[PDB]
Design a binder for this molecule. Structure first.
Ligand SMILES: CC(C)CC(=O)Nc1cc(-c2ccc(C(N)=O)cc2C(=O)O)cc([C@@H]2C[C@](C)(c3ccccc3)c3cc(C(=N)N)ccc3N2)c1
Length: 238
């Protein structure tokens, strides 16, 4: 996160850190708890992820340094990547992780509501991007979970900012005209969370952008509302 500040413990209880175990304990991507055995994240995070066996999902974490040998985690039973996914810049940058065990909800770990298809018309004015990603282009993964408040940008305005790309309605952009606050490397897969009528909704999944926090280059996110049907298809399969 560029231009963010440290989160307080329990502030974003749906935020998870997805780790890889080889050769050592390392953060891979962010993710969001959406159900008691379901994490929503980005498809691009998974290149080179051959088997779900190398994954560990950690919830209720503020600092990466908390991650101890005896820290509880969730194993991943399955990785479900959208079948139309090719690359972040072309969309369909979404994936589900089915957990091996159930998350027991607490003040430190609980789900975020999906947007309502009937909420595709709502205007969110209180949106935050969170993560352990870089604070600048050439950096490293952060210890403390960072947060940044960013305004949503209309699809039409975002398309003006990325004239050489196709910004679809399955993408949502967020950023300040002058730049300064944005997601960056390591933040992908994590949430773009918006508060509406006292309820937090998972509006976006951190995906891509042209650099980080640049003037007139908003961050591009997977527009979760456009995937509610896909999510239900995968999570509610008979
Ligand atoms: C070798 C090639 C195949 C490259 C490859 O591997 N791609 C790849 C790998 C990573 C990556 C690497 C390591 C770790 C880890 N955990 O160490 C985690 C990640 C991670 O997923 O974030 C990231 C991306 C992009 C980068 C991008 C566009 C960007 C462009 C320019 C500079 C910085 C960032 C960006 C911008 C914004 C924003 N400004 N809103 C949001 C998301 C992203 N994500 C692609």
């Amino acid at each position: 996160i560029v231009g963010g500040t440290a989160s307080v413990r329990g502030e974003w209880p749906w935020q998870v850190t997805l780790h890889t175990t080889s050769p050592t304990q390392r953060h891979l991507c962010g993710g969001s708890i959406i159900g008691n055995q379901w994490i929503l994240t980005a498809a691009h995070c998974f290149y080179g992820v051959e088997s779900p066996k190398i994954l560990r999902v950690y919830s209720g974490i503020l600092n990466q340094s908390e991650i101890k040998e005896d820290t509880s985690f969730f194993g991943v039973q399955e990785i479900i990547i959208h079948d139309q996914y090719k690359m972040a810049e072309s969309g369909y940058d979404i994936a589900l992780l089915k957990l091996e065990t159930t998350v027991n909800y607490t003040d430190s770990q609980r789900p975020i509501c999906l947007p309502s298809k009937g909420d595709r018309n709502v205007i969110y004015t209180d949106c935050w991007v969170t993560g352990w990603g870089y604070r600048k282009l050439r950096d490293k993964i952060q210890n403390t979970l960072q947060k940044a408040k960013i305004p949503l940008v209309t699809n039409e305005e975002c398309q003006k900012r990325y004239r050489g790309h196709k910004i679809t309605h399955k993408m949502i952009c967020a950023g300040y005209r002058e730049g300064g606050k944005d997601a960056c490397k390591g933040d992908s897969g994590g949430p773009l969370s918006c508060k509406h009528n006292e309820v937090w909704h998972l509006v976006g999944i951190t995906s891509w952008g042209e650099g980080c926090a640049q003037r007139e280059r908003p961050g591009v996110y997977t527009n979760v509302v456009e995937y509610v049907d896909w999510i239900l298809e995968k999570t509610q399969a008979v």
